[PDB]
Amino acid sequence: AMEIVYDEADLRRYFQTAVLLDHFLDDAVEVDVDAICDGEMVLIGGIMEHIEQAGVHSGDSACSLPAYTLSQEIQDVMRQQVQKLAFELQVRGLMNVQFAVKNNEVYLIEVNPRAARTVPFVSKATGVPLAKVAARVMAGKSLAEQGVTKEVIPPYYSVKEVVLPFNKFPGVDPLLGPEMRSTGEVMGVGRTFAEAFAKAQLGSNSTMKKHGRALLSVREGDKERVVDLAAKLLKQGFELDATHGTAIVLGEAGINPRLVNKVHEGRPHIQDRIKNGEYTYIINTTSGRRAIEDSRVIRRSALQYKVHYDTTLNGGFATAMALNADATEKVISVQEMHAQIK
Amino acid sequence: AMEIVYDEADLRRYFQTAVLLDHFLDDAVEVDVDAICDGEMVLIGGIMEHIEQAGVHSGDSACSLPAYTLSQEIQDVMRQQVQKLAFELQVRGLMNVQFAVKNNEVYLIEVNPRAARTVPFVSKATGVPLAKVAARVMAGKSLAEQGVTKEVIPPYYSVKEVVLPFNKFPGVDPLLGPEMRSTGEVMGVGRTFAEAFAKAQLGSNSTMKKHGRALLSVREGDKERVVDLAAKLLKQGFELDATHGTAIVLGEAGINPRLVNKVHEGRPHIQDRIKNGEYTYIINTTSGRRAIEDSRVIRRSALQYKVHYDTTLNGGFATAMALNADATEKVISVQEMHAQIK
Ligand SMILES: Nc1ncnc2c1ncn2[C@@H]1O[C@H](COP(=O)(O)OP(=O)(O)O)[C@@H](O)[C@H]1O
Ligand SMILES: Nc1ncnc2c1ncn2[C@@H]1O[C@H](COP(=O)(O)OP(=O)(O)O)[C@@H](O)[C@H]1O
Ligand SMILES: NCCC[C@H](N)C(=O)O
Ligand SMILES: NCCC[C@H](N)C(=O)O
Ligand SMILES: [Cl-]
Ligand SMILES: [Cl-]
Ligand SMILES: [K+]
Ligand SMILES: [K+]
Ligand SMILES: [K+]
Ligand SMILES: [K+]
Ligand SMILES: [Mn+2]
Ligand SMILES: [Mn+2]
């Protein structure tokens, strides 16, 4: 069990219902790095950039390989850092390192000196049987001996999306967090990140549509970025609805969504609309034990009515990008994929 | 002093701060009727339909002569009632009768058996020197004897608008009500009501513009009619701003105004907006001691910053109509006006 606490009051509050204390790196990009070390050298197996930010369990985040936003300069650091760790820890086989990038700054989240659940995905993306190799390394056959020394960077985009069990436990708030709840994952391959994500998204059983009306109800910290997303949704032909505070901000930017009522506000309210299959998309971000408990109805309704929803703005952006792609336009075999690698 | 109470709780409330009790005729048209009685006949001097509903003092209302929305059928009833009254009360010279029309039904508000302040405006509009005629009647010369026996209905519209002293007492809520606060009045002459109104309004020192951004903030009981008004302003080329509840209503009608925060809501709020010259027009209707006192800010700011504002929906419609006219287009002299009378 892990929880994110925002203020002093919040602290106690936890403590009640309730030890390591760690500063929470807000508005940070989470990254996964799987590599192999034989004591001589380090092979970077893969650098994966999570769509959802730090604060949403890596196991429940979608991810990209290669990274789709991160600078080469920054990857390189992470790359260097790993290597440092790999030798220091005396890693012999597979390892995994999780970072957080905030303000062009690389922070260390943790190091797992073993095979991580990311391995298979990378293996598939890169064509390198990381598990086998590392195995061979563990048994005494160096990377140099294996002829696996250079890090592979694929020509295409490899996106991993997860599947959540919420529909099996309705009394639960289908909301992301620091604790992992997913049971499985899917993989999307595309020429473009937008194409890969669209494949992964569909693959994950999403009910996202390429039209209709979107509901936007984001948290403060997001109110500022929501604008561009609304704009993207608007470019696509979506009609917008928005709750008070978010409508305010949109409006202030030249965007007038249709104002909707919260549940305790009037009628109809969001639940009603959701229920009536008024939406095709819902973006809903929240921050705070209270804010969360209070928005619980949106999410529960959304899940129940099968409306694709995102609980992260990062995730909303990706959903948006993918509207530009066509998941059924082109198919490629794993064999072909791997053949494309130089 | 006079006040309008809405519910039991409201009654006590008043009582505290605080007797003739009268049912208030909501959503009713107020009408003024000036006439002369010589004991033999009754001369209808004029039938003036106010713009502002009953509840807003006749002295503080703009008015039209002739009526601009009242059926001939209904007027005729009021004309017959005035007659009945004239003879019954024994009037000899001037009289004024006040009615309220609600649901096609004529209701009597009061009878002033003397010269009313509307007498000069009616004389002007009609070319008939009512005070001079009623004076002769009082002195002994009948209507028949002076050859003033038929009611005059001018070929043009005559609108009267008032001037209020709120700008002299800033600590005062510049809102209309059952008590008269106006100091003076102006007259507008036009080929149509819209033209007469425009001239009256301009005449009144209104800072109304034909473009810009309007702010709509209406009461429940008005949220239905507001839509049409919102549309009218839209047709004109105005951009709309509105508060929550209003925005909700407009939204459901397909009109998506730019959301604006009430003062307690956040930022920016109307006060800020008004202060920063964003609006060129304001429509704010309010009902209830509490509702009123809360909305006080809008009105005060509107007056301080010199934005034209209407505190009645009926007023807003009239303002709307006059946007279609040009009060500088054509001028006419009183001698000319009177010469057009047949
Ligand atoms: N300091 C932190 N700042 C932001 N997010 C963090 C922080 N520590 C952990 N997280 C988030 O919580 C997740 C779980 O943390 P982690 O220590 O790796 O847990 P686990 O033991 O389950 O592997 C991360 O994948 C990340 O999204
Ligand atoms: N029963 C009523 N229903 C609606 N409006 C009314 C009613 N009684 C009075 N009013 C409003 O109050 C104003 C003043 O009432 P009135 O009896 O004429 O007082 P005063 O002697 O000052 O003229 C009217 O011009 C009208 O706007
Ligand atoms: N990979 C996380 C699941 C995505 C889900 N639509 C959410 O945003 O909650
Ligand atoms: N006829 C009364 C003055 C009108 C003023 N603009 C108001 O609506 O309050
Ligand atoms: Cl359950
Ligand atoms: Cl004052
Ligand atoms: K993450
Ligand atoms: K761990
Ligand atoms: K009136
Ligand atoms: K009176
Ligand atoms: Mn972890
Ligand atoms: Mn009166």
Short mmCIF file of C-alpha atoms in Angstrom, two decimals, chain A residues 94-228:
data_model
loop_
_atom_site.label_atom_id
_atom_site.label_comp_id
_atom_site.label_asym_id
_atom_site.label_seq_id
_atom_site.Cartn_x
_atom_site.Cartn_y
_atom_site.Cartn_z
CA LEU A 94 19.08 -8.42 -16.45
CA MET A 95 18.33 -5.26 -14.58
CA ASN A 96 15.74 -2.62 -14.72
CA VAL A 97 15.88 1.03 -13.76
CA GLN A 98 13.04 3.48 -13.34
CA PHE A 99 13.55 7.19 -13.66
CA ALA A 100 11.59 10.34 -13.47
CA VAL A 101 12.29 13.37 -15.62
CA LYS A 102 11.29 16.70 -14.19
CA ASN A 103 12.48 19.98 -15.59
CA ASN A 104 15.07 18.36 -17.72
CA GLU A 105 16.32 16.61 -14.60
CA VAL A 106 16.74 12.85 -14.15
CA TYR A 107 15.68 11.38 -10.88
CA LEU A 108 16.19 7.81 -9.73
CA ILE A 109 12.99 5.98 -8.68
CA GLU A 110 14.37 2.49 -8.22
CA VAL A 111 16.54 -0.31 -9.48
CA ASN A 112 15.41 -3.86 -9.93
CA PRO A 113 18.38 -6.12 -10.39
CA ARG A 114 16.36 -8.80 -12.11
CA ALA A 115 14.10 -9.58 -15.03
CA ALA A 116 11.28 -6.99 -15.18
CA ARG A 117 7.82 -7.41 -16.61
CA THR A 118 8.96 -5.11 -19.47
CA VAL A 119 11.37 -7.62 -20.96
CA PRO A 120 9.04 -9.44 -23.24
CA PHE A 121 7.73 -6.25 -24.81
CA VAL A 122 11.20 -4.91 -25.47
CA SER A 123 12.25 -8.30 -26.82
CA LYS A 124 9.45 -8.10 -29.24
CA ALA A 125 10.03 -4.55 -30.13
CA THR A 126 13.77 -4.90 -30.62
CA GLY A 127 13.99 -8.44 -31.86
CA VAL A 128 16.56 -9.18 -29.19
CA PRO A 129 15.70 -12.12 -26.87
CA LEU A 130 16.82 -10.27 -23.80
CA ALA A 131 15.88 -13.13 -21.54
CA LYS A 132 17.92 -15.71 -23.42
CA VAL A 133 20.94 -13.46 -23.73
CA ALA A 134 20.91 -12.49 -20.15
CA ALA A 135 20.48 -16.12 -19.37
CA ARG A 136 23.60 -16.96 -21.33
CA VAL A 137 25.34 -14.19 -19.48
CA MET A 138 24.30 -15.62 -16.15
CA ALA A 139 25.74 -18.98 -17.21
CA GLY A 140 29.14 -17.49 -18.13
CA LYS A 141 28.89 -16.34 -21.78
CA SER A 142 29.67 -12.58 -22.05
CA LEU A 143 27.74 -10.21 -24.33
CA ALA A 144 30.80 -9.81 -26.47
CA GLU A 145 30.89 -13.64 -26.76
CA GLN A 146 27.26 -13.62 -27.78
CA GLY A 147 27.73 -10.88 -30.35
CA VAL A 148 25.16 -8.72 -28.72
CA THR A 149 26.85 -5.53 -27.88
CA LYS A 150 25.12 -2.67 -29.61
CA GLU A 151 21.89 -1.18 -28.46
CA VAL A 152 19.01 -1.65 -30.92
CA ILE A 153 16.80 1.13 -32.02
CA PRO A 154 13.87 0.04 -34.12
CA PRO A 155 12.69 1.76 -37.24
CA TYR A 156 9.06 1.61 -36.09
CA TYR A 157 7.12 2.64 -32.99
CA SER A 158 6.34 0.05 -30.32
CA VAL A 159 3.58 1.04 -27.83
CA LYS A 160 2.48 -1.04 -24.94
CA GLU A 161 -1.00 -0.53 -23.48
CA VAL A 162 -2.53 -2.22 -20.39
CA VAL A 163 -5.88 -3.92 -19.55
CA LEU A 164 -7.57 -3.27 -16.22
CA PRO A 165 -9.82 -5.53 -14.18
CA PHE A 166 -12.19 -2.81 -12.97
CA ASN A 167 -15.10 -4.33 -14.88
CA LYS A 168 -14.85 -7.38 -12.66
CA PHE A 169 -15.19 -5.26 -9.46
CA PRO A 170 -17.76 -2.53 -10.03
CA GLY A 171 -17.64 -1.26 -6.46
CA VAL A 172 -14.15 -0.07 -7.25
CA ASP A 173 -13.14 3.36 -8.56
CA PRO A 174 -11.57 2.63 -11.95
CA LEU A 175 -8.83 5.11 -11.36
CA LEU A 176 -5.05 4.99 -11.89
CA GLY A 177 -2.44 5.33 -9.15
CA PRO A 178 0.84 4.36 -7.53
CA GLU A 179 -0.38 0.83 -7.01
CA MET A 180 -0.49 -1.64 -9.90
CA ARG A 181 -3.91 -3.16 -10.75
CA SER A 182 -3.62 -4.35 -14.37
CA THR A 183 -3.77 -7.97 -15.37
CA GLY A 184 -2.38 -7.79 -18.90
CA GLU A 185 -1.02 -5.75 -21.77
CA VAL A 186 -1.16 -5.31 -25.54
CA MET A 187 1.32 -4.10 -28.15
CA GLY A 188 0.83 -1.65 -30.98
CA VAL A 189 3.32 -1.24 -33.84
CA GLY A 190 3.32 1.78 -36.12
CA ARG A 191 5.35 3.94 -38.44
CA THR A 192 4.35 6.82 -36.20
CA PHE A 193 3.80 6.99 -32.48
CA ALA A 194 0.27 8.00 -33.21
CA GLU A 195 -0.13 4.83 -35.28
CA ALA A 196 1.35 2.54 -32.66
CA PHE A 197 -0.75 3.97 -29.88
CA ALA A 198 -3.82 3.71 -31.93
CA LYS A 199 -3.07 0.03 -32.39
CA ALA A 200 -2.32 -0.51 -28.77
CA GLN A 201 -5.43 1.39 -27.83
CA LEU A 202 -7.71 -0.62 -30.00
CA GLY A 203 -5.90 -3.75 -28.96
CA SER A 204 -6.69 -2.95 -25.33
CA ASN A 205 -10.40 -3.19 -26.05
CA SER A 206 -11.04 0.58 -26.04
CA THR A 207 -14.42 2.01 -26.94
CA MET A 208 -12.91 5.24 -28.22
CA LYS A 209 -14.73 6.65 -31.32
CA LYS A 210 -13.52 9.08 -33.99
CA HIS A 211 -16.45 11.40 -33.44
CA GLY A 212 -19.19 12.69 -31.11
CA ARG A 213 -19.08 14.70 -27.92
CA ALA A 214 -16.17 14.83 -25.41
CA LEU A 215 -16.47 15.61 -21.78
CA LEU A 216 -13.68 17.57 -20.22
CA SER A 217 -13.33 17.89 -16.44
CA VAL A 218 -9.71 18.42 -15.44
CA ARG A 219 -7.86 19.43 -12.30
CA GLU A 220 -6.16 22.78 -11.74
CA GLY A 221 -2.69 21.69 -12.56
CA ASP A 222 -4.10 20.55 -15.91
CA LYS A 223 -6.50 23.43 -16.65
CA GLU A 224 -3.68 25.10 -18.51
CA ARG A 225 -2.83 22.24 -20.85
CA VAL A 226 -6.39 21.13 -21.34
CA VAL A 227 -6.77 23.96 -23.79
CA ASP A 228 -4.61 22.45 -26.43
#
